[PDB]
C-alpha cells in the first residue's frame, strides 16, 4: 500500500 511504479509496463500498483 505505497503506490509503487512498474517502469516495465508504465503502470502503478502495490507490492502485492
- Do 3 and 12 touch, CB atoms closer than 8 A? yes
**N- to C-terminal Cα distance for the chain?**
9
CA 7 remoteness from chain centre = 8
Q: In this structure, what DSSP letter does residue 11 have?
A: E
Region of 8 (left: φ > 0; alpha: ψ -120 to 50; beta: rest) is alpha
From residue 16, alpha-carbon distances to 7, 12, 13 in Å are: 16, 12, 8
- What are the residues facing 5 on neighbouring strands? 12
Q: State which approach was used to obtain the coordinates.
A: NMR
CB atoms within 10 A of CB 16: 5
Burial of 3 (0-12, 13-18, 19+ CB in 10 A): exposed
Amino acid at each position: 500500500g505505497e503506490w509503487a511504479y512498474n517502469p516495465a509496463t508504465g503502470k502503478f500498483x502495490w507490492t502485492e
